């Protein structure tokens, strides 16, 4: 176990390793800073997008008109407007 | 310059139409 363990430590001792495991629980650490409750219906949105996109087997400008595209461009703003708050 | 040569490409536009689609898909009316 001794000589498992040297092993181990000796190539985990790279500076790639620690930075990962690091960077995996920074990971882990900003994923629980991330609040999930109101992220729910942004993920029922994505799926209904995504089964959109998938159901399609000059364009910006009959897009705009829309008003589903409309509203969700201006859902997209004000989500825009939120990230970087002056706080 | 890069934008006004690429919106013209058959391939861009199939997909930022494709990428319009999936923004007319989120916040559906439902
Ligand atoms: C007297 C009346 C004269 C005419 C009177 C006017 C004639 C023209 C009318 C307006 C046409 C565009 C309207 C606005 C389109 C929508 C808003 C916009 O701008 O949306 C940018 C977006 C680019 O996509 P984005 O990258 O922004 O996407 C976002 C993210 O990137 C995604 O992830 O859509 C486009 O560009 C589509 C339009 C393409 C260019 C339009 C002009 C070309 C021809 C001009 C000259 C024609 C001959 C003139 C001959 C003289
Ligand atoms: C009589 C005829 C006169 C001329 C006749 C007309 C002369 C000009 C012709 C039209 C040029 C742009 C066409 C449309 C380009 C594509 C549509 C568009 O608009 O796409 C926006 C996008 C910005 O990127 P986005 O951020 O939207 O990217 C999306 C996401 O963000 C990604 O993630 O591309 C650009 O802006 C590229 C064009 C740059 C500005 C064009 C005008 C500059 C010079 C004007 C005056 C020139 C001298 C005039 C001298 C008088
Ligand atoms: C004359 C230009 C025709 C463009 C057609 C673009 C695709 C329309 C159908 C989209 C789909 O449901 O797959
Ligand atoms: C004479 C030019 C008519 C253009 C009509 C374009 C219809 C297809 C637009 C693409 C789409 O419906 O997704
Ligand atoms: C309108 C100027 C302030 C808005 C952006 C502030 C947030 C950016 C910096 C956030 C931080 O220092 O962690
Ligand atoms: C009316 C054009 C005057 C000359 C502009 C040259 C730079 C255009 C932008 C090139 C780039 O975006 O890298
Ligand atoms: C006289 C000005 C000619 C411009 C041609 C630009 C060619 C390179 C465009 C960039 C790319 O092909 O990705
Ligand atoms: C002033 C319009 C001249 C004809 C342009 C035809 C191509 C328009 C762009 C179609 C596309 O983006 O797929
Ligand atoms: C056109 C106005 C309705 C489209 C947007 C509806 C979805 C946004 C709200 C979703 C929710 O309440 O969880
Ligand atoms: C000036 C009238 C003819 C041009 C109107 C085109 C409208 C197209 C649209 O609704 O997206
Ligand atoms: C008016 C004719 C000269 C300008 C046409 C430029 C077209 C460029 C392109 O196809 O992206
Ligand atoms: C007569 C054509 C006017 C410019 C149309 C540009 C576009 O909507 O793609
Ligand atoms: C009066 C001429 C209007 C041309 C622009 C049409 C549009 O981009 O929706
Ligand atoms: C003569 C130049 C007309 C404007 C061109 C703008 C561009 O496409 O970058
Ligand atoms: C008639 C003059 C057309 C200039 C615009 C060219 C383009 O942006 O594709």
Redesign the interface.
Known sequence: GDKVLDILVKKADTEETANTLKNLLLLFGTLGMLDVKQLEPLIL??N??????V??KF??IR?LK?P??N???T??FSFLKGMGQDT
């Open positions: 949105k994505v209904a997008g995504v089964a959109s996109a159901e399609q364009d910006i897009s829309d589903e595209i509203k969700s461009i859902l997209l």
